[PDB]
Amino acid sequence: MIEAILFDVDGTLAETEELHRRAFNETFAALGVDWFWDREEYRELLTTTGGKERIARFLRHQKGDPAPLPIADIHRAKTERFVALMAEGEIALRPGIADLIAEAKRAGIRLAVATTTSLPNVEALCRACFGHPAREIFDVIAAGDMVAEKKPSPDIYRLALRELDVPPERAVALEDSLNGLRAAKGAGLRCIVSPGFYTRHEEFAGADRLLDSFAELGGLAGLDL
Known part of the structure; x- marks a missing residue:
């Protein structure tokens, strides 16, 4: 599940x-x-x-x-x-992101961010891309200095999972970078990777799926396999 x-x-x-x-x-x-x-x-x-x-x-x-x-x-x-x-x-949100989040919401699936970016950065993105404050989109916001050790440390993901009260087997992470993949994997999470402009040069050995676009998931269905 x-x-x-x-x-x-x-x-x-x-x-x-x-x-x-x-x-x-x-x-x-x-x-x-x-x-x-x-x-x-x-x-x-x-x-x-x-x-x-x-x-x-x-x-x-x-x-x-x-x-x-x-x-x-x-x-x-x-x-x-x-x-x-x-x-x-x-x-704009990256392709597939808006549709996945809407599907998840309809399905009663909780959403979290786990990021090294600061809280004002998260709020700015949510206002601009979702038209709503972050807390209205994401159930749990684990960001910035909420942990001491940053990605590739898994600490931010462990915090997110603790706040969600959801064990890793019932969760999945979407990432764009090697440090991100490593952090998700260190928290025991299956991780879907799609690189962006600044990480297309990286290698993502161990990613559960590696995609050119999150749209290739076809929504929630792509997260099961």
């Missing part, structure tokens, strides 16, 4: 990371520092999950301007920009 479906957010519900990159760059520009993350560098920086963590890693190694503000302050400013960007643009 599928009692619950768990979703990563960025790269799974919607293709958002390019917008995140824009928000980072426009933030650095706004602060007047010489930092710029191009697509190539951002692809590498995405192996560090967590916004603050990604900023920290970069600032530990980069040779340009020193940080003018602490990590958290930079991330807050970037978050405000991302939230604004989500509100104005026309971000």
